[PDB]
Amino acid sequence: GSLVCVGTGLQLAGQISVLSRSYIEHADIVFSLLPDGFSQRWLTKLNPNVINLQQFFAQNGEVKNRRDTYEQMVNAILDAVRAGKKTVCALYGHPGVFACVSHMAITRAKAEGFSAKMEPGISAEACLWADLGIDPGNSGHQSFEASQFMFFNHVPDPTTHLLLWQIAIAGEHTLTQFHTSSDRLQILVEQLNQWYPLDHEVVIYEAANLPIQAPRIERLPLANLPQAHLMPISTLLIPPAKKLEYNYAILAKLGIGPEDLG
Amino acid sequence: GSLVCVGTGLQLAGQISVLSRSYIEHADIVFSLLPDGFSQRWLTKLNPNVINLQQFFAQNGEVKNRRDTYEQMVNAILDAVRAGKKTVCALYGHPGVFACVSHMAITRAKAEGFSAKMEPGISAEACLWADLGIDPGNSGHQSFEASQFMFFNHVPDPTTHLLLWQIAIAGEHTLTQFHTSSDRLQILVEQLNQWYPLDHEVVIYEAANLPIQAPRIERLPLANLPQAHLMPISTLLIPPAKKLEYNYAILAKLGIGPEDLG
Amino acid sequence: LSDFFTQLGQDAQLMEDYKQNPEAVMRAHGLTDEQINAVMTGDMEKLKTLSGDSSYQSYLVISHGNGD
Amino acid sequence: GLSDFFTQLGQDAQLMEDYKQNPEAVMRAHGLTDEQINAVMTGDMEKLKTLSGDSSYQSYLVISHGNGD
């Protein structure tokens, strides 16, 4: 048995890598986590032997910690590998970007003596740079999970493009609800106000999943975030609050100044 | 005329999107910037109408500001679009990630009334998460261009995975040399020592371009960076210097403590 | 509907035909007036209705911010 | 023959999984010389480019700078 984890990207059918599609084609069995029924149908036509990982999230209002959902997904993947199957895990986006299940399954598979690897894919952030026409190198980039930004000590550089992922569950500490509350988002706004003014323009971004669909690019003042319509897939982009300033200390050690910059 | 900018990913032939390959296939003309002659041959077999953008870098020891190279690349692309050609720009990686030519060409094309868009691709950072088994969500992620970190005021969060891109030209202020010096990298080490101890293990990462090739994953103490062999494609990964610590301030506003986290 | 979206996502020729004339391309691939209306108003929920997925359930959060 | 093999191997998951099982057997079966196989097993990318006749071709892959506006 063996494991390869691939990404399908965000867009239906066309955003998967040529090699990653060939892995899906030739797999004994595929474990899928895909955005919609169009994507599910496309996959099933590629390879009919598919187990849908969606079944492991809480059903019908059940209280279930997402840590247990993820453990159950990893165990299901590993059961196929342990049985001797040439196993592919086909996740949306990039299988290792804000996605624990593939990293955990590859760690466990290697520890049990099986061949396991991860093929990179096109993530929501890769779609954002393209859709917004932003280079993360322009003034640099920072990414945090929104709840981790609230629960632990993180300090953003306000010259950079800042991304808070999973903004829809920001401050949902139980890992048992699918969305947060407007009061939790108001506390996030107050926290961000240490670096960003309340009238600072921010962007709610959602990558499109269908070729006929435009991405969501909603611009609003930070103050208005707790009243905004958010979906599990939403990411909050916080553009720079300040322009780049000259690092005189280091320029002097280099024996140059601003006027010497090419 | 029209412009679509695509990425080819880092690996030969297999890391391009299904859709992005189809755009190259059906283009009137392709402007290429690819890692090697194997990639160039693969492209030429896909579409024989190729102009190689490599020609616009300084040749034979010429002194040329890279800003001029990039202008000349953008102008070449736009001349095909202005002539009426259905134009594709095929860059390695992601065409908009630490890559100015495609964003500039798309801005200019839109301003002159032509249809222009960018298709996301698999970048070197996407390859790194897969190769190192690191999720940027785990403790967060920050990316800066190494020289921009030295020349302007950037403050890293030392709980995150920190990436310094283009580390091989760190401090090369003229934009006319292809690599920096040992003394420039020693100044970067002293600068980073504000947040990272001198014995802090860092990683020199290079994504593989050929399917028979292993990525470069070189672990060394930060102090040893200025003696390291670096190539233009090298990225410096600086893993966390500190574990995540509880944000008691925000937990108190949420009315919870660490013991309440799911 | 599904066959059309799958072809359109993968085929740059059809994508560039579609972007020139969305309604003409959709009509030629058999999409109903209601389906085309759903596309032109960006109503992804009604498109899923019209493709009949017996509400296919799709939560795509695969990480958390609680550490450990 | 080098370039044809690498292009197939990079795109085809079946050949990739055959290759990873037995690199030398797969490379011999696709006609690679003893020197080419040696270059692959030692990770000498420069010699492979020599042997394909390509590296001579100039590849600088920096498409951005850190000097601002």
Author numbering:
A (entry chain C), B (entry chain A): 2 to 263
C (entry chain D): 4 to 71
D (entry chain B): 3 to 71
Cite, word for word, the article reporting this structure.
The α-N-methyltransferase SonM from Shewanella oneidensis MR-1 iteratively methylates its substrate SonA at two residues, SonA-L63 and SonA-I65, in an N-to-C terminal fashion on the core peptide. A five helical bundle at the N-terminus of SonA, now referred to as the borosin binding domain (BBD; 1–53), serves as the SonA leader peptide and is homologous to a portion of the fused clasp region of OphMA.
Both residues mainly affect the apparent kcat, where SonM-Y71F is more deleterious than SonM-Y58F (~100-fold and ~10-fold decrease in catalytic efficiency, respectively). The overall structure is very similar to wt. Loss of the hydrogen bond between the carbonyl group of “i−1” and SonM-Y58 results in minor changes, including a slight change in the interaction angle (from 108° to 114°) and a deviation from amide bond planarity (Ω angle is 178° and 174° in wt and SonM-Y58F, respectively). Both SonM-Y71 and SonM-Y58 are both in hydrogen bonding distance with three main chain groups of SonA-2Me. The side chain of SonM-Y58 interacts with the carbonyl and the NH groups of “i−1” (2.7 Å and 3.6 Å, respectively) and the carbonyl group of “i−3” (3.6 Å).
